[PDB]
């Protein structure tokens, strides 16, 4: 396999864009996390007083186990792969590897029967996946989304006071500012971004079918529910007390849906930026002094990848949350694809950041449009009329706007014919589209 011959663009065309996820989602990562889980389980038994058959671990034993995790590499992963030759269960190959390693330590040599003690394969797998999700989000996904938010915020702040014609149903409307329109997207991102950071990833640890049966058979006297809760919560996960063989994956569905919400806001953003480029509101920043068009390719690339990511995330939320009776195995193969969904998202985020850095505001395009659309002041005139209790204020302005092409002159002429205080007239005669932006700039400044 080379990136040239890869079928998926995640490991092919975009291989350099997605590498950050490889330590979390890959056959190597899954092996690393299963190994970590098996060792940490064994350690939890050594740490428990009511399980005297596993003695407390001494300095040298702790370090040996610690070193298995920090020294884990391709070579060692291949060794575990070697053991898969013998087993029905991949997870069993990790137990075999550990049995092998325990021989190298005087104290551990003796304790091999307690590796994977009372566990089912899914006890190990669900924890491994819970940790992969938790860490991919904490180290890669949440920080990247934070960066995109900062990027759009910076653009919003910079263009806080840049007046702009609105378009509602595609057509000239009450003005805003470019920075306000940009800040609106960051405001939408805040809630699901915080939700993404805060979700504790669910995990269970309770034997074959969720009832600690084998645990209780061997150690009726150990408080297994307490032991397993403390084990799982020690890893920074959300202990699920109530499961079958599998953790039911509703937490994966929740995380998938948070990602969908984020991706859809960003989808909306890429489509609006593309429109602003189309209108010439942005040009390329970088003959050196001459204005040039910016190619919106990065936003179009993000747009395509955001949809692919959602396709998979939506599927996960729907499919993983049914499993026949105490479970069917059809979720296993699907879980190997969590990384693919996050990868399409990540590629999209990188594209948004890259496109954002190309944008330079084109003030003259924005000003041309405002100066051609004086009709957008009509509501200002109408609302001032209302204040002074003028009856048919809306109909009157509709009669005006539909009967002539409005500019400064006709507006002034209409205003004078109104029965409103002279000061009120004067203020309306000062109004221009570029100065009818309401609280747009104030809202941008207030935004954090």
């Amino acid at each position: 396999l080379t990136a040239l011959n890869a079928i998926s663009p995640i490991d092919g065309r975009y291989v350099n864009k997605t590498r950050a996820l490889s330590p979390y989602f890959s056959e190597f990562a899954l092996t690393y996390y299963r190994l970590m889980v098996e060792i940490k389980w064994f350690e939890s038994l050594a740490a428990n007083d009511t399980i005297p058959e596993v003695p407390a671990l001494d300095n040298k034993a702790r370090k040996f186990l610690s070193d298995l995790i920090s020294n884990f590499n391709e070579s060692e992963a291949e060794k575990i792969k070697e053991f898969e030759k013998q087993t029905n269960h991949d997870v069993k190959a990790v137990e075999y590897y550990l049995q092998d390693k325990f021989q190298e330590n005087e104290q551990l040599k003796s304790c091999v029967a307690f590796i994977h003690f009372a566990c089912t394969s899914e006890d190990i797998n669900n924890l491994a996946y819970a940790l992969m999700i938790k860490q991919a989000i904490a180290q890669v996904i949440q920080p990247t989304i934070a960066e995109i938010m900062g990027s759009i915020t910076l653009l919003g702040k910079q263009h806080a006071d840049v007046a702009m014609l609105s378009r509602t149903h595609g057509q000239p409307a009450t003005p805003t500012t470019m920075g306000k329109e940009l800040v609106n997207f960051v405001a939408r991102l805040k809630r699901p971004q915080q939700q993404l950071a805060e979700v504790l990833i669910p995990a269970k640890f309770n034997g074959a079918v969720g009832n600690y049966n084998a645990h209780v058979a061997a150690y009726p006297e150990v408080d297994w529910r307490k032991h397993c809760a403390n084990f799982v919560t020690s890893l920074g996960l959300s202990f699920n007390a109530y499961t079958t063989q599998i953790e039911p994956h509703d937490g994966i569905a929740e995380v998938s849906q948070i990602m969908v919400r984020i991706n859809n806001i960003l989808l909306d953003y890429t489509q609006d930026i593309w429109s602003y480029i189309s209108l010439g509101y942005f040009k390329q920043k970088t003959s050196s002094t001459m204005p040039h068009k910016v190619n919106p390719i990065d936003f179009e690339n993000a747009e395509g990848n955001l949809g692919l990511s959602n396709a998979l995330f939506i599927h996960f939320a729907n499919k993983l949350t049914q499993s026949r009776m105490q479970r069917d195995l059809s979720d296993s193969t699907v879980l190997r694809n969590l990384g693919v969904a996050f990868s399409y998202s990540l590629i999209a985020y990188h594209s948004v950041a890259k496109g954002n850095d190309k944008l330079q505001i084109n003030k003259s395009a924005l000003q041309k449009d405002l100066s051609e659309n004086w009709e957008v002041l009509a509501e200002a005139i109408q609302t001032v009329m209302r204040r002074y209790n003028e009856p048919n204020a809306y109909e009157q302005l509709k009669e005006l706007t539909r009967g002539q092409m409005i500019d400064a002159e006709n507006l002034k002429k209409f205003i004078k014919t109104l029965s409103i205080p002279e000061e009120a007239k004067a203020e309306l005669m000062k109004l221009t589209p570029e100065t009818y932006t309401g609280l747009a700039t104030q809202l941008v400044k207030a935004f954090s």
Copy 2:
């Protein structure tokens, strides 16, 4: 239109099952909520000291406005429909109606210019829909889901101690209890049910494009952001400070996804109950004394409706969250269908409740299966072996289980050949599949 000739089964075949939603989602409801919003806006202006042009409302005026809402009916809705003849905007027809009504009150007669003051149609619509969603969830949806949860919980409690063979990949596995398997579903429902109750429905109120432009044109001196925040929050909604013409609908997406999560757990439930019926684990409760099969039709009906509801909820979350620039109108028609999605859910909930009430446990079916599958004790033997540091405990039991058809006799014989303490042997020889349920019943009792 009669229910016989309706195209949608929501207003046809299932008309009686869905009526509870009509006061929240229907052209009548939308009119009622727009009217309420317009009146409450007008009242907020009267209540504001910095807007002296609308005087504080006296006893009689408050009651008149109050009465417009409580006395609203088909007759009045038809009257508003009458005004739609004149207008581009449906919401405008409500203003016309109110202009008409204000004539009937000495004080209100004078204040007609302040109805819909500085508002855009979408200010009224988004609030109306926010309230419809909020109240449909608070009065109908959340309580119905609470009822389904209670129903499954009661079944779980009743069958807490009823031993049952598990099936993993469809095949005999470590035992559980029927009540434990039922409680697992309620445990999954807890989190999204609480999330459904807690979501404050987003709403905005800020003029044509989100910047209070018309407000500021007429009243530069009024703190509009404060006024509008207090207005929206007074209604029990989540004020959105940052919008275009529309509220961006990410809250609708969040609510839709919570509903999807709930529906998927219930989808899983209907499919498992169907399987338990298929296995004869349940029979009909209601020749009077003779056992009869229960027809799983109610669970199959729920299954079909849960999928339809999700189809729409998924669509809402994806489609409503993009809108071109300061908005396109394609969301309007889509919002008229929120009730349809909730209706498919509601029909499904009613079906689950109805099916649940038909289930009677069939103990002999459950016992037959346990007594035929002694192989499921193997892990108990293995894990006891591990405790006493016996080396190849897993391989030994695999060699046993794959070479003979296991019953009590072969098991006893194998156990005796083990090198474990005599007391350990004795306890394993007491074990039976129906008594190998681990902490299933303890977990059911602990469940709330």
Copy 3:
């Protein structure tokens, strides 16, 4: 139920837009088609020589049965509903109704035991639904799509020669004509429209589980496969020889996917028209002589409804095509919603037709844009250079276009500096953006 209180906008806000579908999809329609199917089955037995126990029907008997179908009304539907009080199966209520009616005819009085002979409920239901689909498509859906195609074609023909600036990635590109851009959509619609017309709707008729078991028990000597094939094919349907209790619904999936393909082309159309309106390329046709903006609301309404229709059609294709073993009943409730999906489509088609009729071309907007974008001729210059074997033709024009703002003057100046035949220069100096439309108009004229 009134349209005001309906939850679904299909039977509410849009009740008048969707009535054409009521005779095909409604509880009344389903009853009508079940009745028709039961009668036509009974007639097929009378018509079979090897079934002498049902005598050939005489003039009076044929007319009596014929009249049951043509005289079917609300009153009669209510009577069948009356019998549902007694039955597990709705279809059984139709048999009871017919038993009742057969008493009114001397010959039929005697043959009541042969109503629903050897049938299962699903034999009747699948045929009823097959006919509802077949006829809704033949009478309503396919003709409406044909009308939309004609509408867009007429617009295309009218604007065949109207030069227009293209936009690729939102930005000025090689010109086309408005009519060519419109005709492109009709070209896409041709194939799935023909496919929609040609699909023969699958139907089966073979007893409880697909094997004619009950038929063969009573009449081992009758060729049931031949009888049932001829019965189903006589109705204009596609006989499925191989089924369980249900027809497996892959034909419904195929039809749903054809509808999805059509709806997506029309979705693309509504979005482009909205953009052309936004650019001012269209204005309202209908102060009388003054240009006015067209509001794109009809296209936005179509856009929203097309997505809703696809949401349901996609769901049907995925969900209806699994059914557990010899069937589960969860498809039943889902089938009652086929009409809802077609209804969202129909509302969208009506909206497209209505919007199309508002469009008037705005030539000056189109001409302004062409005259401002002479850079789009660059490829013409380059390709003429290639013809005369000029080496770096692309790089040279990129060097030109990126270094100055191109107009007629700079272009002429550049052209003269080329080493190409004098006649070649002269033809390029004649070129203008509005005259660089290639074969756009020729392709429009050729289109049918």
Copy 4:
């Protein structure tokens, strides 16, 4: 990149299962097909009499071009990648490569200006993708589906006469045969499999925006529509005369939907096989002589991958079929993922084939169930009653079946109490559930 560190299981865990697709979908494949398209275009110009500026190619020139395609390798792909350093468009790098190669041939040296003559990048890309799709389907996908169909057919034929209890709504029903139930799936696969083989993949070739503008600028006298039609149809593709810059991708949507239809039938199959395994109807074929359970893992793996494939195929059909105006670029990145969808399908097909080969019928399980469910003969008794005009035949059998547990004895006793011919009684008294399979075996034998 190694398979261990790949994020996608397509190029990771399942790398060996998916390699067949690499020559069709990979950055290498895309380069190969772009190169082939560019060369074949150039050849089409040489072959055209009205384009004398490109002379007819001589033996040596044809072979040189031919050799570029057959000798294409990683080395050459890397060389094209080298040129991407200089270009905005990847396709341009192929032109540069060819310019380079043309130097090595006396005749071709002279014709470099005609490489990519009048083409746009998308002319090359859409053809390249059309060929990749066409060939992946013809060489890999359609033959693999053919193999799965044969596999299920063989199982159906082998078990043609093996009586089996049906289950409708999970519950005992009229018998069938195992082979009939299997053949039902192959019958469903026939139509979409033939449709998959027959679809001619759409492709266009017409310059920047679909109008041959640049072609006509340089060669007004050449019949470009005829030339390009013949070019595209010579490649075994479906010429699209009517496009913008892109081929509109409705053919990709059609192919995606055919794949969805196939995958859903196979999804249904994997779920039923899993149920038959659960019931013990199948055991493992391979202590040597003792019956052992078959683990349904291969069917569960297929189930998971079929859903992933559909997620992507559904997305393609919806998203690729809109593109803003004369096109946006967001489809480009999405097209790089066509292979991923086909790969999930292929992995699933391999799993189905692999699971099928493990199944051995377990006759005693099937016979036990039939012999315990004599109630399923009731409809036979009822239908024989109907034949001899017995009035309440259905109600009578319901009264029987609901009042006692039916076996051979009660049935015989009931039959004797009927007023039907003595021969009719005798034949019903011979009936047993295992002999009430109707035309199941006859239908299996007839199946091809």
